[PDB]
């Protein structure tokens, strides 16, 4: 009877459309009815896949509790479907399930064997079922791993430059570990496209998360904003003193052959670093780190000069060579060029006498240049004053407190 | 103008495809269009993301990788020959001069700005031509110096609303 009583429910569902019954089943069904394999839907679903392919999703569910499904391509198809024949506002439906439905898809099979087949998917899926672009969800999370797996960073740029604010409940379903996963994963992103500050950000936002619980997930974004605070300024950035206890308790211990690189970097001797670094390869290659702390090294020879830079005003090149220990002046003049050309430095070579001169006045605050730049940064800044107006009046309304003081 | 467009093309072809894995010819045209905007990680990340039978397909990507690697090594000469020693395909003629156009202007650029005396020899080292060629060249731009020292020298010779809206906010 199951059969007709899916065809008819259905039809008042949709149709008649009223929310009470069809939140009723939505729920009934839930994680507890969804068990026991399919409702027979092997023979009665074939029929019913093709009556409305609407109230089917949550029966998608089920059809993906049974592991290794023997057609993949049913899948391609209903959301093609759901993609095509998507209207738009009725997506509302699917809020709280949807999550789940393709977390469960991707953490199959998209992830062992065609991890790019997914990557427009679930971008797709996001601005169709998240209310707000303010709000982190935890199909973020899957699509930030489905794009470092797949080694492509492009596409999930725009969902990572807005700063995520608010985080949808998912009905109690987003676990604390999805959020932590998405400030990490995608912290990998910016460490691909040489974005360091705001890899530092992300690396800093999943440290200072309140958990009493070691993970693993911790521990590498740990590892990783050391090595890009490294990396990028001449030492490790003190973390915000809110953050969690456990991560000066337990983290840190663990975590010891960073921290000694750390000194070593700090101590201004690049001759020692590489030892160190030949000291402990292993360690760095057990935790994939063979390119990173490779750049930390590179980027010592250029903090070096740039100190040099604010002490000479003009200086030989075998001088440079001697001070920066780059062993030869031409290797001394390779590395000024190049960093000039990246605008680290302010510089000039006079190949005459093999100088190499510092002219450090690029800016004098006279052009319209700054004053855009002033400009953007009151529009930016009467953004989030409005936003944080808005939100202060937003959490007024409560009566939690303020009875009677 | 019509580098962005192709981008775009591009990009759209890579983000939805039924098939799955596209041709060798797409695929080398995207390496050469992000070899062209000097954006070097995109280029190495879509590089490595390439299945090993497409790139034994044709020797074309063999080709845009060599370029890739000698142009990431900053070895302007080695770009300069690598940019002509081998042949290619025709949709990726028109972007193969278009990028050393491109590396030229940057080698101008760079050799202008990064130098204020430079041997003659390192500047058409530094142009992939013919030293006479530049001397004549650089002479009638006027940016050179002399001869016989062999010693180019490369010189480089609504407020009113936004106003009210910042007072508006400021009043609360």
Redesign the interface.
Known sequence: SALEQFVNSVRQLSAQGQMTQLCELINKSGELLAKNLSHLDTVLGALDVQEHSLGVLAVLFVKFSMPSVPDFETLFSQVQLFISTCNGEHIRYATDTFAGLCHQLTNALVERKQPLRGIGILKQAIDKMQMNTNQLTSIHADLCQLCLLAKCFKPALPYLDVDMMDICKENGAYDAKHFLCYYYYGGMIYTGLKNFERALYFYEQAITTPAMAVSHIMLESYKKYILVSLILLGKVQQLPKYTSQIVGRFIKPLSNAYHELAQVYSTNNPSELRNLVNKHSETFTRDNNMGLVKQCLSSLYKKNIQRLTKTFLTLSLQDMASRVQLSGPQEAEKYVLHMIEDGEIFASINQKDGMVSFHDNPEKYNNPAMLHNIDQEMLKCIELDERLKAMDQEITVNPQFVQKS | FSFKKLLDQC?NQE??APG?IATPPVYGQLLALYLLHNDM??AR?LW??IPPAIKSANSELGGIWSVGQRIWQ?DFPGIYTTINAHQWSETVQPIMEALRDATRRRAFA?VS???????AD?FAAFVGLPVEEAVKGILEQGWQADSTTR?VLPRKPQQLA?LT??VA?LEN
């Open positions: 990009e983000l939805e799955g990680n995109n990340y490595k993301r900053r760079l700005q990064a130098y204020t005396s430079i041997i390192d010693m936004r809206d910042y906010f």
